[PDB]
Amino acid sequence: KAVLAVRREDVNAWERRAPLAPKHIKGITNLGYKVLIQPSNRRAIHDKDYVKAGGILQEDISEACLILGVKRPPEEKLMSRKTYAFFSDEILKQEIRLIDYEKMVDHRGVRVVAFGQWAGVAGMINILHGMGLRLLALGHHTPFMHIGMAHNYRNSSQAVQAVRDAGYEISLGLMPKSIGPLTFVFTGTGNVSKGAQAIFNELPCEYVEPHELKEVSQTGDLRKVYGTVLSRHHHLVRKTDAVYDPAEYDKHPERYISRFNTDIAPYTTCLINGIYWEQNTPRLLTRQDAQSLLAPEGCPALPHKLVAICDISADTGGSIEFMTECTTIEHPFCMYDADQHIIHDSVEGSGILMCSIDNLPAQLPIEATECFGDMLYPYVEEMILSDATQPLESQNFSPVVRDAVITSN
């Protein structure tokens, strides 16, 4: 008797995802609920697949009490006496219940509704493409020229075949010698970091311990790429006695510094940053660290070892002090040059190539939709039996859903 609707995305041309996939609509209709799908040429999964799974294609979504979307409408489009959920008072004036997927957390306070590894997958394809263009601008044709942007591929499978194909060229010795071994450092603990690792694993890779990076950055095999996973214990020490205690760094991070600038950064070609930075944590790199890193025929050496930094988390303006500006899917790369200036939509001149896109998952919209839908599915029935007309206190919500309401009730 209660009716669910999936709204069309209207916010931005790049929003090709949805909060639920066909298989989720097949599940919800098998529980006897009616599900309206608002027609959309924008969605990367076609309307006829939502219809095949028992959804009814219809512009008018007035009858629905739960409306699921990805991004909040401009507020002009919000029907009254209904519950909306998005990835986000004025509207509180009315009887409108708003839910924020980002605030849906377990008893420990860890998120339970997200895009999983998919930001890392897209970020790693993006930065490999970026390094192709950056190294050509410095005068080096490489096999990284043969990897496009994440959104130029049908799905992660087609992307993986292009990464393996460029990997074969590297493994056959088609890199230029003069630029030396290539080193990749991965930071952070989450699913997003595993995604970037999963793309790297398709190249002719070799994982080393952080202390080895000094050696392999000089004498590594030029038919391979080198990776290292960086953990807290590798680079964080107390200001007093240069010791690491994990229980103490959790409570009082202010007693700690990072040795990343002296121990790892000078031996790094590409930093993939997956850290979630906090207001009292040590930084990986400062503005002064950048000055020192930059200060240094047809076959030149690199101007300096560090070519690129890709941010795959939220943390835009955190661990790397000078990475202040976000990039976009359309303009993915900017340069931090030797005069401490950001040059937008460019891979030319001096300095460090940087990539910081806020909606990386949208570049792989089908797999992003499947993954998100899987995490949301168990909570959908609670949300369908939500009543915007009644008080919050009387709703049969789990703490997960209750705590994620961002309206007065």
Question: What's the angle, vertex CA 184, arms to CA 352 and CA 349, rounded to 5?
Answer: 15
Contact 16/42 with Cβ under 8 angstroms? Answer: yes
Supply 221's token pair: 């095999």
Q: Which is nearer to a second copy, 349 or 378 (CB)?
A: 349
Interatomic CA distance for residues 366 and 399, integer angstroms: 29
By CB under 8 A, is residue 295 in contact with a second copy?
Answer: no
Cβ burial of 74 (10 Å; 0-12, 13-18, 19+) is: exposed
Name the token pair of 91: 């509207």
C-beta separation of 345 from 331 below 8 A = yes
Q: Which of 4, 16, 104, 113 binds a second copy (CB under 8 A)?
A: 16
Nearest approach, Cβ of residue 165 and a second copy (Å):
6
Which of 26, 71, 72, 146 touches a second copy (CB under 8 A)? 146
* Amino acid identity for residue 18 in this structure: A
Residue 13 or 31: the one with the smaller Cβ distance to a second copy is 13
Tokens of 231: 């953990």
> In this structure, which amino acid lies at residue 373?
G
Binding string to a second copy for residues 353 to 382, with x set by CB under 8 A, is what?
Answer: ------------x-----------------
CA 271 to each of CA 13, 182, 286, 353, 385: distance values in angstroms, whole numbers, following the listed order? 30, 11, 14, 10, 46
Number of residues that bind a second copy (CB under 8 A): 45
Q: Is the Cβ–Cβ distance between 140 and 182 less than 8 Å?
A: no
Q: Does 50 bind a second copy (CB under 8 A)?
A: no
Q: How far is the CB of 157 from a second copy (least distance, A)?
A: 10
Q: How far is the CB of 186 from a second copy (least distance, A)?
A: 25
Q: Which of residues 321-340 bind a second copy (CB under 8 A)?
A: none
Q: Which residues from 152-171 bind a second copy, rule CB under 8 A? A: 152-154, 158, 162, 165-166, 169
* Site stretch for a second copy (CB under 8 A), options 18-26, 139-147, 263-271, 353-361: 139-147
Backbone angles phi and psi of 356, in degrees to 5: -150, 85
Q: Which of 246, 288, 299, 398 lies at the binding interface for a second copy (CB under 8 A)?
A: 299
Closest by CA position to 360, among listed 293, 272, 281, 299: 272
Kindly tell me which of 39 and 378 has the beta carbon lying closer to a second copy. Answer: 39
Nearer to a second copy among residue 3 and residue 174 (C-beta):
174
Per DSSP, 283 falls in state P
Which residue of 46, 214, 233, 287 would you call a contact of a second copy, by CB under 8 A?
46
Choice between 349 and 399, CB closer to a second copy:
349
d(CA 260, CA 234): 9
CA distance 277 to 275: 6
Judged by beta carbon, residue 173 or residue 296, the one nearer a second copy is 173
Is residue 139 at the binding interface for a second copy, with CB under 8 A as the rule? yes
Is-contact 186 179, C-beta < 8 A? no
DSSP 172: T
23 binds a second copy (CB under 8 A): no
Residues lying near a second copy in the complex (CB under 8 A):
8, 13-14, 16, 38-44, 46, 48, 59, 129, 136-137, 139-141, 143, 145-149, 151-154, 158, 162, 165-166, 169, 173-174, 176, 178-179, 297-300, 365
